[PDB]
């Protein structure tokens, strides 16, 4: 299948409560594999998946150093963002970054990412060409100008085409047992009367990996989007995910409704009904 690697940074200022906190988490697909927290007792990059544990001591030292340097970089970025937006030093602000690469079944780069946000809004992003930037506003345009002058995009492209897909290839092989195993959803429909002439039909998907799934209800073969309550896909805590979709239907009409399930672990989409 197709795979992704992503690193996620959160840098959060907290005036009066020390220097800004810096957290990094790294994922392959929906699996957390590494974490760093500047508030840790003795901050370092820590393994969070068994298959990364075979990386040698040199890996962990190098990765820890990157995170320590980043803590300083992102603290500077917070100071700079204050200036560019004419903001006071009294407030708490957040910078986020996400970056990494997607690869296909053959392991070749599909596309690269490097995006930053300030206070939950887009700030600057590397374009899909990996050679130019999109700045969200006149503040980010200052950063864009700096990064164009310094040829930052070329250096990101070299990482994204090289080390990013190189390390992801290695992780996928080392973690092949888990990373390259799709667990299909365990599915069932429950039936609960709400009142005399209304019932809730809830279509459940449990125990699936990766998180991507589609659950829909149809009535007489027609999509019921507006009258479907669909919860956000949620982690079970055992690597897997859960989701449900519910529809309120008239009593006696249950057999007109079908739940449809699509997931990479299923060779074909499933069709389910209430089974009395």
């Amino acid at each position: 299948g197709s795979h992704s690697m992503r690193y996620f940074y959160t840098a959060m200022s907290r005036p009066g409560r020390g220097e800004p906190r810096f957290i990094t988490v790294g994922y392959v697909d929906d699996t957390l594999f590494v974490r760093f927290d500047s508030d840790a007792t003795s901050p370092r990059k820590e393994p969070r998946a068994p298959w990364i544990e075979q990386e040698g001591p040199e890996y962990w030292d190098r990765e820890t150093q990157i995170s320590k340097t980043n803590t300083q970089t992102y603290r500077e970025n917070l100071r700079t963002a204050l200036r560019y937006y004419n903001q006071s030093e009294a407030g708490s602000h957040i910078i986020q970054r996400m970056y990494g690469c997607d690869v296909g079944p053959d392991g070749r780069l599909l596309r690269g990412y490097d995006q930053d946000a300030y206070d939950g809004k887009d700030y600057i992003a590397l374009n899909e060409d990996l050679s130019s930037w999109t700045a969200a506003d006149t503040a980010a345009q200052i950063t864009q100008r700096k990064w164009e002058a310094a040829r930052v995009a070329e250096q990101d492209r070299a990482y994204l085409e090289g080390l990013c897909v190189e390390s992801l290839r290695r992780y996928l092989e080392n973690g092949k047992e888990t990373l390259q195993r799709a667990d299909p959803p365990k599915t069932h429909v429950t039936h609960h009367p709400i009142s005399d002439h209304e019932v809730t039909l809830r279509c459940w998907a449990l125990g699936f990996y990766p998180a991507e799934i589609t659950l829909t209800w149809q009535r007489d073969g027609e999509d019921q989007t507006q009258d479907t309550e669909l919860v956000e896909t949620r982690p079970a805590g055992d690597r897997t995910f859960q989701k449900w979709a519910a529809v309120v239907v008239p009593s006696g009409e249950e057999q007109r409704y079908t739940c449809h399930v699509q997931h990479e672990g299923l060779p074909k989409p499933l069709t389910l009904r209430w089974e009395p």
Binding site: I66, T80, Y84, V152, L163, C164
Partner: peptide, 9 residues
């Protein structure tokens, strides 16, 4: 693996 270079805003 991460990239060790980061430029500031």
């Amino acid at each position: 693996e991460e990239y060790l270079k980061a430029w500031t805003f």
